[PDB]
């Protein structure tokens, strides 16, 4: 039962997914002024399941666009980027402790 | 107070008495035996020193643990301990001397038979307890700070070789005369015919009688041990000036 998949849990996959989410959020912030650009969103539950056992969605606007067709709510995008950054760090702390716990068990110190 | 004084004194008040106690054990007959492990002996010395600590007077504070005078103190504690230990070895090996002289005269390992039995005498008569009582008494009448074995003590301890032979001969004189007279009687009685001789035939006759005489020796050996222990104990008290 001693295997990296069993020891590292889902934290070996969550870090990559939250990095993907940061890229999706960042390109929405950068493309905020581009007309015709639809804000993209990444489902966390689907992406995590796909990574665990081996296509970004569209974000519905809360208000109509002012005539450019761009549906990026830059007020909302900043909030999601901040949350993803904190959760990305938390997953790093979880995953980092997985290797440290294995090392201290192996080395006995 | 400055904590240096409290901690240093206890180490000085414990290890220095322990060194004398431990040094006596490593040279002692029973505790210095090859059967017991050093760890068991080490714990015994640690436990004895801790228990007899109240009877040990406080060591002088003038001598420092880290100084050449303190280094000399450690050495002279061992010399006292080895002095008591060698006395016990002197007695047992004298009985080993008694065993081998009988065996040699028996036309012949017999020392081991006497060595084992004498060890039983040492244990049965509580000889080990008396030695432990002697070393703690040594702390009283021979203080750790000022005091060590003088030249006269060395000469008295060096003169115990004569004590060995005189005591060993005294124990075996009756038997050794018996061994000689029967062998001489056997020689003269069979000297009429030089064809028989003795050689190996004499070897068999001599050893059978020699074993039989050793049976007589073990019959009255206990009284000799009691007198021998009194001589040895008096020497030990002389060393510790008791």
């Amino acid at each position: 039962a001693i295997s990296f998949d069993n020891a590292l849990g889902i934290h070996q996959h969550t870090v990559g997914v939250r990095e993907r989410n940061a890229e999706v959020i960042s390109t929405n912030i950068a493309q905020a002024n581009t007309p015709g650009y639809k804000a993209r969103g990444l489902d966390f539950a689907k992406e995590l399941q796909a990574a665990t056992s081996g296509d970004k969605l569209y974000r519905l606007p809360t208000q109509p666009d002012t005539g450019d067709g761009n549906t990026v709510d830059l007020d909302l995008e900043r909030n999601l980027f901040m949350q993803n950054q904190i959760r990305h760090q938390a997953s790093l702390d979880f995953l980092g402790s997985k290797f440290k716990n294995l090392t201290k068990a192996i080395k006995g110190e | 107070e400055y904590p240096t004084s409290v901690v240093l004194d206890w180490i000085a008040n414990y290890f220095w008495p322990y060194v004398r106690i431990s040094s006596m054990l490593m040279v002692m007959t029973v505790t210095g035996a090859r059967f017991v492990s050093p760890r068991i002996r080490l714990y015994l010395g640690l436990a004895i020193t801790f228990a007899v600590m109240p009877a040990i007077p406080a060591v002088p504070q003038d001598i420092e643990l880290l100084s050449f005078r303190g280094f000399m103190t450690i050495a002279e504690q061992m010399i006292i301990g080895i002095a008591m230990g060698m006395v016990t070895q002197f007695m047992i090996q004298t009985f080993v001397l008694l065993g081998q002289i009988l065996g040699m005269q028996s036309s012949l390992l017999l020392g081991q038979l006497f060595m084992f039995l004498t060890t039983m005498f040492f244990l049965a008569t509580d000889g080990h307890l008396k030695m432990l009582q002697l070393v703690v008494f040594s702390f009283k009448t021979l203080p750790i700070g000022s005091g060590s074995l003088n030249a006269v003590d060395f000469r008295e301890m060096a003169g115990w070789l004569g004590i060995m032979f005189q005591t060993a001969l005294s124990m075996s004189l009756s038997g050794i005369i018996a061994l000689l007279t029967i062998n001489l009687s056997f020689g003269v009685m069979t000297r009429a015919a030089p064809q028989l001789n003795i050689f190996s035939l004499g070897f068999a006759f001599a050893l059978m009688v020699g074993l039989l005489l050793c049976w007589y020796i073990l019959a009255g050996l206990y009284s000799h041990y009691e007198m021998f222990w009194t001589v040895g104990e008096a020497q030990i008290c002389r060393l510790i000036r008791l």
């Binding site: - | 012949l108 017999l110 307890l129 190996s200």
Partner: protein, 207 residues
């Protein structure tokens, strides 16, 4: 009571004194000495090896002292885990079963000697302090081990004397009796089922 941080430090420190407790309080001392004496009795010097001698003693000292561990568990370990007793009381509750075992396995004469040397006035044997009982226990157990061990030595010394005298009877004074006696020394021990006989008596010797 001591703080949680301190009482964790206390048990952790004495966890490293467990070998010390075994050697000078339980039945490990007597068995090892008897094993060592019997090893020297036969011509083999280190054939049983030290590790095997210790391993047998560790198993024996657990079976024989099993009643001691039972009382310590139910009187000290169990009350402490239920918060029915404090740290110091639990530690004292463990000393009593072990002090009773040591007191009954010593010699009066040795305890009389040690109380005189310790300079403490105690009227009855069953009230002596543990500081003086521990050295008295090992001193008495050493005497018992030596007396038991050397009696086992006697039959193997009998074989040596018989074979040596027989060899000297024929004039073969140069043949070493020890090499001739060695096969017969081993046979005596295996015919009497020695490895079971000594352990059975050693186990039954304690109380």
């Amino acid at each position: 009571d001591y703080s949680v941080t301190l009482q964790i430090l206390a048990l952790m420190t004495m966890l490293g004194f467990l070998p010390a407790m075994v050697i000078l309080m339980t039945s490990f001392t007597r068995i090892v000495v008897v094993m060592s004496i019997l090893r020297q009795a036969m011509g083999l010097q280190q054939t049983p090896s030290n590790q095997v001698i210790i391993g047998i003693a560790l198993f024996l000292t657990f079976f024989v002292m099993s009643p001691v561990l039972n009382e310590i568990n139910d009187k000290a370990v169990q009350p402490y885990l239920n918060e029915q007793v404090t740290a110091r009381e639990a530690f004292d509750a463990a000393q009593a079963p072990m002090k009773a075992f040591m007191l009954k396995q010593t010699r009066i004469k040795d305890l009389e000697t040690f109380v005189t040397m310790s300079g403490e006035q105690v009227d009855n044997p069953e009230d002596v302090s543990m500081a003086v009982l521990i050295p008295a226990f090992i001193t008495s157990e050493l005497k018992t081990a030596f007396q038991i061990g050397f009696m086992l030595f006697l039959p193997f010394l009998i074989i040596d004397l018989v074979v040596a005298s027989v060899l000297m009877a024929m004039g073969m004074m140069m043949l070493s009796p020890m090499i001739v006696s060695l096969p017969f020394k081993l046979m005596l021990f295996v015919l009497v089922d020695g490895w079971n006989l000594i352990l059975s008596t050693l186990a039954g010797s304690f109380a």
